[PDB]
Amino acid sequence: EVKLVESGGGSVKPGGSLKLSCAASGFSFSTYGMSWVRQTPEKRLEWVATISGGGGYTYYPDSVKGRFTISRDNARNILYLQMSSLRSGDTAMYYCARRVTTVAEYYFDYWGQGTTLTVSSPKTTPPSVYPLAPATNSMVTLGCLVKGYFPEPVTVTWNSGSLSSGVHTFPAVLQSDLYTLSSSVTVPSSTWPSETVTCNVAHPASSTKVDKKIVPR
Amino acid sequence: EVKLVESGGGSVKPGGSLKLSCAASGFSFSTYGMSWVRQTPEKRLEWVATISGGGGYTYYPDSVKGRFTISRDNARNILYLQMSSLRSGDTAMYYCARRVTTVAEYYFDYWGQGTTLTVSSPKTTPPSVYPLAPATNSMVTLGCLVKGYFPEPVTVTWNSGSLSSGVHTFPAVLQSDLYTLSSSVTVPSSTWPSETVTCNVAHPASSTKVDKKIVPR
Amino acid sequence: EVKLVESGGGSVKPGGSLKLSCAASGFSFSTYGMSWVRQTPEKRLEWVATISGGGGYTYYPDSVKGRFTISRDNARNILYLQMSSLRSGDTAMYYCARRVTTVAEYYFDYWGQGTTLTVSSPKTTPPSVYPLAPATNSMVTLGCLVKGYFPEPVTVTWNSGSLSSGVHTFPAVLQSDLYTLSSSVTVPSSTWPSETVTCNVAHPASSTKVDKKIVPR
Amino acid sequence: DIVLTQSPAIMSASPGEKVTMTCSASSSVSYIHWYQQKSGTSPKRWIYDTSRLAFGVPGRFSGSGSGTSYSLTISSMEAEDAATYYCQQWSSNYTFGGGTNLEIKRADAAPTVSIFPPSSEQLTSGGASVVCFLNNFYPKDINVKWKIDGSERQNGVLNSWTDQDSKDSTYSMSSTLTLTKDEYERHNSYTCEATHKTSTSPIVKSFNRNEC
Amino acid sequence: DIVLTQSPAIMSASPGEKVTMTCSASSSVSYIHWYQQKSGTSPKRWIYDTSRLAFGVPGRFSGSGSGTSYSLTISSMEAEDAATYYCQQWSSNYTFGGGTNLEIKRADAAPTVSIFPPSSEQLTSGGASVVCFLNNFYPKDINVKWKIDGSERQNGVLNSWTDQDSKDSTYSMSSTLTLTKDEYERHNSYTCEATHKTSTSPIVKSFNRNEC
Amino acid sequence: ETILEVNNVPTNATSLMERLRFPVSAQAGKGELCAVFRADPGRNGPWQSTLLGQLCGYYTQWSGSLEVTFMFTGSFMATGKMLIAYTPPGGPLPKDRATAMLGTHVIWDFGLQSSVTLVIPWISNTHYRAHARDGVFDYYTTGLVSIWYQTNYVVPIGAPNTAYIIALAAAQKNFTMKLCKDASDILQTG
Amino acid sequence: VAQLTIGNSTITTQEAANIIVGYGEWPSYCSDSDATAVDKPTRPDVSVNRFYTLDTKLWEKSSKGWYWKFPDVLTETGVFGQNAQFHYLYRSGFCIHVQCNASKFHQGALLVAVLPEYVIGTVAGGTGTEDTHPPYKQTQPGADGFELQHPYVLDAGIPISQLTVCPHQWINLRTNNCATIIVPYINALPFDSALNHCNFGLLVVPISPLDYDQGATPVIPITITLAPMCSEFAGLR
Amino acid sequence: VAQLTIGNSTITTQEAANIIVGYGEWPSYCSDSDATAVDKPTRPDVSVNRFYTLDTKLWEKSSKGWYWKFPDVLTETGVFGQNAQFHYLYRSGFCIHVQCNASKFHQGALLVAVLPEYVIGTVAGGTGTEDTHPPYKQTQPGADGFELQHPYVLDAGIPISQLTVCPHQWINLRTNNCATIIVPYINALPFDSALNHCNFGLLVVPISPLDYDQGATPVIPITITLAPMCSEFAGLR
């Protein structure tokens, strides 16, 4: 299979520099031009650079020409993107793409799975988890509010995966330059509170993992 | 993929009319002739009609020539079968098939998954569920007798799927022009009655869903 | 698919004779030469015989030439290997392989899944299972020591498969010309001893199956 | 008005042996085609123009026949083939055959019998159904008798069979004796005895009405 | 009487780096072939005639060699490749190589140690086995000592190792000290201390016999 | 010209038709020895299938130049070269392709010509032999014909990676036989 | 390439490949000083002598080979089968033409020869003790022909490896596709029965098996077209 | 198409493609008024001068190119290698023939030229400061030949882009497959050593890489057949 798998990234403070790399597999790398593309929080796609099949020419867009530099080493089949003087507008998810030739134009066949870049000045913060029980019927909806952490993401698991079928995970919302999300689970009244329900919140950025038993109010 | 997916059907009283349709996908529809076939409760297969590649000719068998009419609209890749003056002998499961050309004869490559037609005069009846516990060893076989419903089918789920590995579902048997089935589940004596076992009977025809806790007698 | 599936084997006392067979599927059997290969307890691979595409020639190695005889019947696509005057050094796992032609040499494309041969003089012995509980934290590691059985293998299942995610099965070790293995399972302190944990030891050679509830010491 | 008769209707192979299913016609026919139908799924294509195989079909399947008697042969048999196989004719009125239930053979299994007194919910409604479960037996053929207080009964006996298990390749059975409340409390002992090619004597499960 | 020696026997790659396994022969050879064997499964085909790849094999695998020294090279390494690789010769007596255990490298993991007093079921039989579980550690190399009442023992110590975990890529270990009933109740304190390249001092789990 | 069963190896009743043709494939590497046989019309082996062979049996002595013709029956799209060499009586089968390349040989490109005919200059069953206690006027002139893959079998996608070849033999006009000798395994049954 | 015609029959064939005039003789007539100089034997020219194109047989990988008998093959067919039947004696020469239609991606080799007095011999029970005589469907297959069951010995105990000793021609797919053979009247008598005696039999067997990669047509149509030469008949009934 | 023979050697080759007579001269002999008119140099005709067919090399996508040295290639081979060795002087012309066998579905282009005094130059350490002299296996590869490692500069610091200035011929798979070249004796002296001096070297390099879709034979056999012309020797030992 054609595989593009990229590495690097995380939290960087503004002004710092970083280097991203992508590793190729299952196609002759030298015969292709290769580009990076970034996606702002799941909406906007922006081209950032390309490199010719060999050294040859590099091409950049007018938002980045000056700070980023794209490179390749055609012995280990790997793209490189160093980014210097990184700004707040550079936070996004960066994909490495292969550029094939069509009749006239070009097209991006395969995209990697991306690395995530967050350029930001705040600290890394473990989240606070608060139980959501109700102060009357045959179905129970419990919750777990995990508030005021940075950066993203966090992970909410319910009884270690057993309850995945009735779980909604609601996107984290930014305010106070800290993120806040919610998560709900649905359970038949036969299971609760007769049996323990517990939300498990893992925040790898800080290596913090907190468990909340939902106890009846 | 070549896909034939058909729609329509259900319960109809004798004398009423109905129209069935099949939707095509992943092959040039106009270049093929298309037929319907019906299967009586999982045994007998009977050809019911074909249509030429375009309008052209229609062909029918001598059990149906007069009441059914097969049609196609080669803009949305969809077969049609209207059935008028429907009789009791028309109850069955109807598949849409594609007819390819061989050396001399024809052959049906792909069959859809079918719609079900039940021509009948009785009412729609929710089922009654009765527990089956025993009035002595290391394995427990419990049951759930769900009696006197119409039409088919019904669904018996055990503790919401957790017990699927030791479950036998025995075909519904018709008498009193109502259907009656049974369902058994097997459970280690470690689980019962220490833990709730419950059969769940859902009858979509009536939108009726009943739950039975098996309690020790 | 090309399938090589072989049959025969088990425990044999030294001096006895045995016959192994392999069944072919999904390739024209007669046009190929076919060989057996044996693997000593997962380490050493040793060629044992080949047969020509038809009757033709047989070829043997100098460890076996005299006792084994390889045959084929090109009506049911099946290899045969009779082994007479079997010795202690003949214990191993025997694969049937297909031999294709390359530029000059030969190569084995597909291997069957093998049968196991144990040449040995001792009796068949059911195993003894002993619980492993501890005489203090948030994770519990329990065990089950199953000692002094023959031959191999045995099977250790935990609560009937529910605990498979935190289970280590440690290879059986031979001493006293009986085998001895261990098996550990990991469980959150929420589950034990509040809920039954039980190891299940099945020894098909003797058709013996023993269950051990891990009770807190 | 051209009929196709298939023999046999039900079949059982070891597996690893051959299988020969037959489609006989009432009049001379030009070619024959074959389909396959596993349970819950529609018919799949298998053989056409008598001897040509559909893309998927394993090479171990074969086809022949001429005139009025055609046959589908399988050598050798494998547990993945068990389905119902229909033939079809294309000369006049496009007719199908009756099919052949191909099944896996295994060692004989005696049933695991379970008896169930009626439910204290149905009785409050003027009905009483006594149910008997014979689980996981082989082969499929079985006789079961109900013996009320030493008699035997056949009225209101409903018997249902499963399709062959996809794991151990057994069948299961349920037998229901649907009586009235009054007819139920008319007797004391209900008994379902299952007779099989496995055991020598029946397998009897019993209960006396005057205990729950 | 033509022997093939493979070096090294065990290997660990990062992954993302290259891997060079070698098959050396005692006499000059015409070509060499390579197989693969993952655990529980038979050998699969990999390289033939030294440099030609079997249909499945990724393009990242390579093959070369001439005369008496041949080699299989992988660049770059990925967690899906970890298997045992055998070479084979086809000139005279068809010989196999010893294989090369290729494994995934990861960050070092100290073990999670668990001690278990003998069972009050085995003791009623004249035996006493003390068991120690070291779970989820890396790398695989480890020393473990048993210290009874301040001594050390090596008699009757059985040690078993797992294959590398398919999730975190660690290994596990069990150590069993098989004594007699009388020899067991001869002492008071049993202790298993595990020494590793992770921690500076051993990881000690202990118990005193006179408490259960 | 009669078909020479060079591939006289399968005996399995239903594979007897296979003796008539031997094959060449992609799998065979350059230089590999495809096949070999002797120029012994009257003795056992390949020649027994040819009519020549059967007629030699009703005679005691003989001599003349022979002639084998090879026919490639593979796909039209295939191409490659085969080296066919003759090692006169006495000369041992050439070690490899190159050594056979130095002997009387013929490079055959079935990409150009589908047929090729080789001439065996001479064979003479004249040297008498009294082995067991049964005197047999035998060969010794076992001339040898080797055939090596000069190049490999080359084919484009869509063409089978194997093809067969047919050997046809006969003797030149300078052939002769002496001493009628009726001999046969097949006789009129009672 | 060009097309030749004989009456109402018009076949599209290649210019003029090498033809094989069996035994170096051309199918000629029979002079006046014979056995029956009285019953002047009428010689058909009109329709009787033209191009008959038999039901094409399909070559397969597993094909064993085919054979037809003469004049049997035609005694059923058309206005020639008309004469052969309602006439007492017959003598006739034959032009036989065999062609395949295959892509340059198929491979095979068919030997096509003619064998006088081709006498079929069955298996004889198997063990050799049953004196079973070949049926009528095996002795005179008609225009559909019949398949060999033991090609190697030509269902008659004779090596095929030596069939080349008869008027033969080869059809190697990678070189030619059409083979032609001229056959003179061969029999121990001037004339004979057209329904009882089959002067000869046309043989066509795959010496090198048909082959191709998945996707190419799996069966190669073999088309036998044949025409009677200097055919004569005597004594109408 | 037709086949030519020189003694016991018979090669099947195409009618007569364009041959390249290097430098417009034909490999001729050397008259009596020379340097050694006494030791009358014996000129081999019999077996010595015939068709040698070297171990076919397999073209690959990654192939860099090949080269052989003369007369080295043959001083090992047969009865010619016999004379070259146990004789003091040598002069000989050459007919070289190179052919590939590929389906109309392969693509490539091999330049095939001959270069007098082909002097190999290695890498020299890498950085340019090691005076490493090419081995003996690199200077005189024999009949197996040797592979270039820096085709672009022909392992000797010269553009290949200019090799056409030498007796060359092209082999474009989509047009021809066989290339032929006649080479006269070229040296600053009438005669010379057959084991110490390699008058020239045969070069064959893929200028357009071999290519094909998965499924077609992946290696194209290149067969070099060559024959000595007006070869002479002097002073037996």
UniProtKB/TrEMBL annotation, chain F:
Compartment list: Host cytoplasm; Virion
Signal peptide per UniProt: none
Highest taxon in the source lineage: Viruses
All copies of domain Picornavirus capsid, residue ranges: 1-149
Binding partners and assembly: Interacts with capsid protein VP1 and capsid protein VP3 to form heterotrimeric protomers.
Purpose: Lies on the inner surface of the capsid shell. After binding to the host receptor, the capsid undergoes conformational changes. Capsid protein VP4 is released, Capsid protein VP1 N-terminus is externalized, and together, they shape a pore in the host membrane through which the viral genome is translocated into the host cell cytoplasm.
Family in the record: Belongs to the picornaviruses polyprotein family.
Protein name, entry field: Genome polyprotein
Organism from which the protein derives: Human enterovirus 71
UniProtKB/TrEMBL annotation, chains G, H:
Protein name: Genome polyprotein
Location within or outside the cell: Host cytoplasm; Virion
Assembly description: Interacts with capsid protein VP1 and capsid protein VP3 to form heterotrimeric protomers.
Organism: Human enterovirus 71 (EV71)
Span of domain Picornavirus capsid: 12-212
Its biological purpose: Lies on the inner surface of the capsid shell. After binding to the host receptor, the capsid undergoes conformational changes. Capsid protein VP4 is released, Capsid protein VP1 N-terminus is externalized, and together, they shape a pore in the host membrane through which the viral genome is translocated into the host cell cytoplasm.
Family assignment from sequence similarity: Belongs to the picornaviruses polyprotein family.
